[PDB]
Design a protein around this nucleic acid. Structure first.
Ligand SMILES: Nc1ncnc2c1ncn2[C@@H]1O[C@H](C(=O)N2CCN(CC(=O)Nc3cccc4c3CNC4=O)CC2)[C@@H](O)[C@H]1O
Ligand SMILES: [Zn+2]
Ligand SMILES: [Zn+2]
Lengths: 223, 469
DNA sequence: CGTCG
DNA sequence: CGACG
């Protein structure tokens, strides 16, 4: 899909295609997706956030050109957006208000994520996903992200066609199910049907470690 | 089977064949939306001499250099078999020996690759005709010749080709009734999995362009009838043996015979050089009588408007034809381009029918039949219409064209009308066909009478030198 | 498994 | 696709 990618290092094992050094875990890194000569698939060539802009990669609009941008933390989003470059005023006030709301939602999701990481283990999060009729994905990062999504907005109901599991991408929600054994589902929507998240009573001692604060928030998508 | 040359053991080793199983899998995996079109080859090799066993993998993208391979010599054939079976399981989701295979999502699908007296009394023209219609050389060549654009992963068995054929028919049924795009996508993925294509690195296209799918159906029908003709060649003086296999009686019409002169005039007047870059030359005339065809044709013998019409096919099929009479396509086959449904077609002009021989400049000899077809009451149409039911009182269909033989020149041979007149304008307006097309729907309405051998003298350098001096 | 090429 | 933590 996208030509560029950005994310926190899922492991301190990838080597920068420029400085040939190990990229440390959880560190902001940027990849360019290229064709592999070894198999029929695309692979990311990874770079330190520092070494990336030294290869002469002109990115005009990161949020649209780069994948996984909307999932970053707000200050790192600002950093990526800045480094990428080196009646109207009422609507401008409105734009500032929407940006404030977006920052609120972003840092809220991240606070929930690292709070859960502080209190709960990986299997605890898998159980939280199971009890809400959610699929357990591959990668503890995705596990935590989906637990946060469910707790904030609500447990995602199954797809209506393939009866699969919907997941949030930078753009909107996409279905990851299989209409048949030959083709995958492609249902895309920004208003998925969901029931309210239900923390098992086991984690009540830690659910007060969430101070409720469920809020009536709704997923805000970029224009 | 064949040892993958990428291993470098084709002359040192062979492929293993234990029990009723051969250890060479060729799996494909296709996703149109994402654009993946991957191949995975797995082989268990055994050294021709000593007891040494290898496992060879070769993956990549079809028809491209993208990919790689690997070769592991194993300590013993037991460990090698374990390795092979577990790799197949991991890549396809099914066991090695499993009658019922079931596709699993994101898993590969296995392709079925096809691997490997002299007292003849008959006259010389008939001996040559039989040599022509039973040429194992040409068939084996056209069948097992290595083409990497139409068969990027190797020759496909008749089973898999028939499967893709049925899938194309399902695609046509889906496009006819405005079916979901999901249906069409599923069918497209299945098809491109069963029929590998070399798309380089471009995403495969959907099977939505009905013209391209008609083309693909014609290709698959060609391959299928080739497979059938080859299955026929292997049955069990050899010339007389094949003559007996035909189940038909053949006689050489005399050149200076008067019916032969009528046939020659028919060929001469009705050949239009307007869409044929060649001239027809009659070599031999043959009178043919099929096994009990006269019997099944009796019910229509006294029917009116019987006509002697042309039918042209590729020579490879003619064997088959003579042993079973002209046959209609099955109800489950997709449409290849014909305009009036499934039946026996004929033409009144030898140009139209001869262009269905597909004779080349290398083999300018083609065969073509004359049949007394009992047309009876015609259903005259100007536009395509897949007829399943003939209107009450009708026995046949006729697609009208812009050019037709002169009706004032009709001849009556055996009480049968022969339209050997020259080409003239028909007077029919708003007609898409160029030459008439007669069509029946009961195999018994046709009685084959004569078979012709024709040289297609193409208008190339030789013809140009012979025509200018 | 989950990450990486 | 395989390789490795
Ligand atoms: N027993 C047999 N063994 C092998 N091939 C056999 C056979 N019986 C029929 N066939 C051959 O199969 C083919 C077949 O079914 N087809 C071909 C595709 N389709 C279109 C068609 O009729 N074409 C067509 C269209 C217009 C005119 C003429 C033709 C052919 N000759 C003409 O004068 C009609 C169905 C055909 O070429 C026939 O001669
Ligand atoms: Zn670096
Ligand atoms: Zn779905």
């Amino acid at each position: 899909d996208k030509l560029y990618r950005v994310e926190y290092a899922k492991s301190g094992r990838a080597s920068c295609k420029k400085c040939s050094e190990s990229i440390p875990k959880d560190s902001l890194r940027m990849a360019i997706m290229v064709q592999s000569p070894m198999f029929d698939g695309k692979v990311p060539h990874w770079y330190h956030f520092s070494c990336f802009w030294k290869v002469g990669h002109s990115i005009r609009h990161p949020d649209v050109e780069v994948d996984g941008f909307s999932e970053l933390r707000w200050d790192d989003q600002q950093k990526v957006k800045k480094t990428a470059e080196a009646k109207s005023k009422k609507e401008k006030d409105k734009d500032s208000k929407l940006e404030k709301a977006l920052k609120a939602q972003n840092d809220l999701i991240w606070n929930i994520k690292d709070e859960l990481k502080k209190v709960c283990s990986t299997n605890d999060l898998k159980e939280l996903l199971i009890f809400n009729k959610q699929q357990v994905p591959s990668g503890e990062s995705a596990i935590l992200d989906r637990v946060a999504d469910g707790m904030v907005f609500g447990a995602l109901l199954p797809c209506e066609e393939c009866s699969g599991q919907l997941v949030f991408k930078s753009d909107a929600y996409y279905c990851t199910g299989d209409v048949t054994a030959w083709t995958k589902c492609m249902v895309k929507t920004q208003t998925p049907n969901r029931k309210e998240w239900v923390t098992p009573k086991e984690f009540r001692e830690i659910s007060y470690l969430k101070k409720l604060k469920v809020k009536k928030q709704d997923r805000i998508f970029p224009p | 089977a064949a040892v993958d040359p990428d291993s470098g053991l084709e002359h040192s080793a062979h492929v293993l064949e234990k029990g009723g199983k051969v250890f060479s899998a060729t799996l494909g995996l296709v996703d149109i939306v994402k654009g993946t079109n991957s191949y995975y080859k797995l082989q268990l090799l055994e050294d021709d001499k000593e007891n040494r066993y290898w496992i060879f993998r070769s993956w990549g993208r079809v028809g491209t250099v993208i990919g790689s391979n690997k070769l592991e010599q194993m300590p013993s054939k037991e460990d090698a078999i374990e390795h092979f079976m577990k790799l197949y399981e991991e890549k396809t989701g099914n066991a090695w020996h499993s009658k019922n295979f079931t596709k699993y999502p994101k898993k590969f699908y296995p392709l079925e690759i096809d691997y490997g007296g002299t007292k003849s009394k008959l006259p010389k023209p008939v001996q040559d005709l039989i040599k022509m219609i039973f040429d194992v050389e040409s068939m084996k060549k056209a069948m097992y010749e290595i083409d990497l654009q139409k068969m990027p992963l190797g020759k496909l068995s008749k089973r898999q080709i028939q499967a893709a054929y049925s899938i194309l028919s399902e695609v046509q049924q889906a496009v006819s009734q405005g079916s979901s795009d999901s249906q069409i996508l599923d069918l497209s993925n299945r098809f491109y999995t069963l029929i590998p294509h070399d798309f380089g690195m471009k995403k495969p296209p959907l099977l939505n362009n009905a013209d391209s799918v008609q083309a693909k159906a014609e290709m698959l029908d060609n391959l299928l009838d080739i497979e059938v003709a080859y299955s026929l060649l292997r049955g069990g003086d050899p010339i007389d043996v094949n003559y007996e296999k035909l189940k038909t009686d053949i006689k050489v019409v005399d050149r200076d015979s008067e019916e032969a002169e009528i046939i020659r005039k028919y060929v001469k007047n009705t050949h239009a050089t307007t869409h044929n870059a060649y001239d027809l030359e009659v070599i031999d005339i043959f009178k043919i009588e099929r096994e009990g065809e006269c019997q099944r044709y009796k019910p229509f013998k006294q029917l009116h408007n019987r006509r002697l019409l042309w039918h042209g096919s590729r020579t490879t099929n003619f064997a088959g034809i003579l042993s079973q009479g002209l046959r209609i396509a099955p109800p489950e086959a997709p449409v290849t381009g014909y305009m009036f449904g499934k039946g026996i077609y004929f033409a009144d002009m030898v140009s139209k029918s001869a262009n269905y021989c597909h004779t080349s400049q290398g083999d300018p000899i083609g065969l073509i039949l004359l049949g007394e077809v009992a047309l009876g009451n015609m259903y005259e149409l100007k536009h395509a219409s897949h007829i399943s039911k003939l209107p009450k009182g009708k026995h046949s269909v006729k697609g009208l064209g812009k050019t037709t033989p002169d009706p004032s020149a009709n001849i009556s041979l055996d009480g049968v009308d022969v339209p050997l007149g020259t080409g003239i304008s028909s007077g029919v307006n708003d007609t898409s066909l160029l030459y008439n097309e007669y069509i029946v729907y009961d195999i018994a309405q046709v009685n084959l009478k004569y078979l012709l051998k024709l040289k297609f003298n193409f208008k190339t350098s030789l013809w140009l030198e012979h025509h200018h001096h």
